[PDB]
């Protein structure tokens, strides 16, 4: 025992991996080095285009790495789609994502499927998304398919949320923000604590005064509508993502964590919005949480002398 792991950091501007190669020292059991020193056990890398090359070559040595190669195939709001469309145990049971397309600065399909819509009489309300990069809330396609061209960015029309569930009192919208934790084995790990980022129509709303609202004002509970089918998408998308990122082969290892992006309507359903890879958090959780991806993502790989999360 007693061992002394290495690790360095090629992103600093990560507050979440700021707060970890803290808790790392903290247990005097590790040792940062030179940005550029190729001896590590660990590497907090960087969010964009990170070397996954130099890694798993020197002889004799472990590497965890805090990010899966290709999970940007879930990240990108283009690509989230792409996945789903492609994906035949999905498209069919995929009724939590809203109609997307991709329109080349498809599209073809968007009108084909924006007409149907205006020709039936029901909400014809959309939404243009870019990929990395403004947006747009309209009803009249070409006056979105001629506003993409301007943008030259590839964005992605989806459905716009016309009956969305609001908050009492000052009547104003919301979203939840899960957060996701799958180590090298791949269990994924739901970080209980979530956060609601409303406006005025803003503040921070969390879990517990949250469900305080679904009751007492509300006729239902927390998990008995949204926690469970919350904890199905992610399930989903993360098992559908399984066999294009498993590191089962690769010279070395990974873990990553993610940051899920909810909404929810009158009819009580919950929709999902995007997926973050390099997601923050709240700074009353940074603490709690940096705790976790270091007990249960990095000292399962690395041992030390010696309720938070849920695994689907
Ligand atoms: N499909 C949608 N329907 C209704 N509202 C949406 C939809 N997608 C996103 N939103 C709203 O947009 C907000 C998020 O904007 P955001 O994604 O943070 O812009 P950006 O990606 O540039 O940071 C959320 O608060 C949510 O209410
Ligand atoms: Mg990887
Ligand atoms: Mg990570
Ligand atoms: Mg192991």
Redesign the pocket.
């Known amino acids: 025992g007693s061992f002394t792991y290495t690790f360095v950091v090629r992103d600093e501007n990560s507050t979440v991996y700021a707060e970890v190669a803290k808790i790392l020292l903290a247990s005097g059991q590790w040792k940062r080095l030179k940005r550029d020193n190729p001896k590590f056990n660990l590497m907090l890398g960087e969010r964009n285009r990170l070397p996954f090359g130099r890694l798993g070559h020197e002889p004799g040595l472990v590497q965890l790495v805090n990010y899966y190669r290709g999970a940007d195939k879930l990240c990108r709001?283009a690509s989230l789609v792409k996945l789903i469309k492609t994906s035949p145990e999905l498209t069919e049971t995929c009724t939590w994502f809203?109609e997307?397309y991709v329109i080349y600065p498809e599209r073809e399909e968007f009108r084909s499927s924006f007409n149907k819509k205006k020709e039936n009489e029901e909400g014809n309300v959309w939404?243009a998304?870019?990929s990395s990069?403004?947006?747009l809330?309209s009803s009249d396609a070409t006056e979105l398919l001629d506003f993409i061209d301007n943008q030259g960015q590839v964005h992605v029309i989806?459905?716009?949320?016309?009956s969305?569930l609001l908050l009492e009192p000052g009547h104003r919208?919301?979203?939840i923000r899960s957060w996701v934790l799958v180590d090298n084995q791949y269990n994924i790990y739901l970080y209980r604590e979530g956060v609601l980022?409303?406006?005025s129509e803003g503040n921070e709303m969390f879990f517990e005064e949250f469900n305080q609202y679904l009751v007492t004002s509300l006729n239902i509970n927390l998990e008995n509508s949204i926690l469970c089918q919350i904890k199905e998408i992610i399930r989903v998308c993360l098992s559908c993502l399984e066999p294009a990122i498993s590191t089962k082969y690769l010279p070395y290892h990974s873990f990553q964590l993610f940051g899920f992006?909810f909404?929810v309507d009158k009819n009580l359903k919950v929709?999902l919005?995007?997926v973050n890879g390099a997601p923050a958090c709240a700074q009353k959780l940074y603490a709690e949480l940096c705790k976790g991806i270091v007990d249960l993502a990095i000292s399962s790989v690395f041992p030390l002398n010696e309720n938070v999360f849920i695994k689907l």
């Open positions: 709001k809203p997307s939404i998304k870019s990069g403004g947006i809330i989806q459905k716009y949320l016309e969305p919208k919301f979203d980022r409303t406006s992006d909404m929709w919005i995007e």
